[PDB]
């Protein structure tokens, strides 16, 4: 059992902070995300992250720039940005924080494409059932103008 | 020499209206476009087109939808939209007008990608000249911090 400096603890706490951060920015009861367990100190860290996330969300030019990348291949995008961010060989906490922020934006960009395809998939089932099982009855109503009548 | 109904006149007037319409929506003296020659009647038509172009520019949801298409292959996009617009086999002047409007938006979308690449091309020349001819002198100044000094 290592302290804060052990890689074990760094990866463990890193995953907790990151997940809590991305979930908080991802927020309909069906879409409720379970809280990440956090001791006091990790909690304070998450609070800090969330405030910085909110200020960064206010920079409209950053938001414009982020939305302009094509995330057809988001993994490629993620590793290019990360590599570039740290290419000069310098490190600071700001950059680590901004990297976490970029990861959360990639989740939301991925969803922006996943949700319409999810919708398309379920429409496929629904319309397929409608066509083979309900269309005959719907025709007897004179099509969807019948539903107009029904609703008055 | 056919009248208004001849295909000759239809294509000729069509090209004049279209070009005048797209140019007007494309508007720095270097970027000044020469007016299309128009008799009175074609002029009135162009006026009408320009007013409709302005109302359509005000529909933000249409603008959002247009900017969301990927014009990596704009010709493909153009013919898909056109085909779809007239797929039901109906015609009216509104649709012809809206098609002209879409063509003008495609010009602006193409430019949105052409301009940064034009910039990149000229930067290539400039930086290439800078690197081989000016860098030695710029180094003697201590790099671009020298220009800071120069400007005070």
């Amino acid at each position: 059992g290592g302290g804060p400096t052990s890689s074990e603890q760094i990866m463990k706490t890193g995953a907790l902070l990151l997940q809590g951060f991305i979930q908080d920015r991802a927020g309909a009861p069906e879409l409720a995300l379970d809280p990440v367990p956090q001791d006091a100190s990790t909690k304070k860290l998450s609070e800090s992250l969330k405030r910085i996330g909110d200020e960064l969300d206010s920079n409209m030019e950053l938001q414009r720039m982020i939305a302009a990348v094509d995330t057809d291949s988001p993994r490629e995008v993620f590793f290019r940005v990360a590599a570039d961010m740290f290419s000069d060989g310098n490190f600071n906490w700001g950059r680590v924080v901004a990297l976490f922020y970029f990861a959360s934006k990639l989740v939301l960009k991925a969803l922006s494409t996943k949700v319409p395809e999810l919708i398309r998939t379920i429409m496929g089932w629904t319309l397929d059932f409608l066509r083979e099982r309900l269309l005959g009855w719907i025709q007897d109503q004179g099509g969807w103008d019948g539903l107009l009548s029904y609703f008055g | 020499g056919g009248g208004p109904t001849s295909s000759e006149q239809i294509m000729k007037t069509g090209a004049l209206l279209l070009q005048g319409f797209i140019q007007d929506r494309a508007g720095a003296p270097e970027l000044a476009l020469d007016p299309v020659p128009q008799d009175a009647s074609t002029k009135k038509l162009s006026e009408s087109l320009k007013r409709i172009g302005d109302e359509l520019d005000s529909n933000m949801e249409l603008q959002r939808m247009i900017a969301a298409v990927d014009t990596d292959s704009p010709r493909e996009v153009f013919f898909r939209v056109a085909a779809d617009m007239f797929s039901d086999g109906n015609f009216n002047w509104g649709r012809v007008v809206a098609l002209f409007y879409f063509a003008s938006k495609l010009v602006l979308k193409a430019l949105s990608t052409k301009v940064p690449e034009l910039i990149r091309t000229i930067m290539g020349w400039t930086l290439d000249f800078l690197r081989e001819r000016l860098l030695g002198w710029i180094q003697d100044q201590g790099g671009w911090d020298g220009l800071l000094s120069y400007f005070g």
Binding site: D70, D84, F102 | -
Partner: peptide
């Protein structure tokens, strides 16, 4: 695209650096 990605990274690096 490759230049859009570069632009984001360098703005993020700048945000990060300006946090200090």
């Amino acid at each position: 695209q490759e230049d859009i990605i570069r632009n984001i990274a360098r703005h993020l690096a700048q945000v990060g650096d300006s946090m200090d």
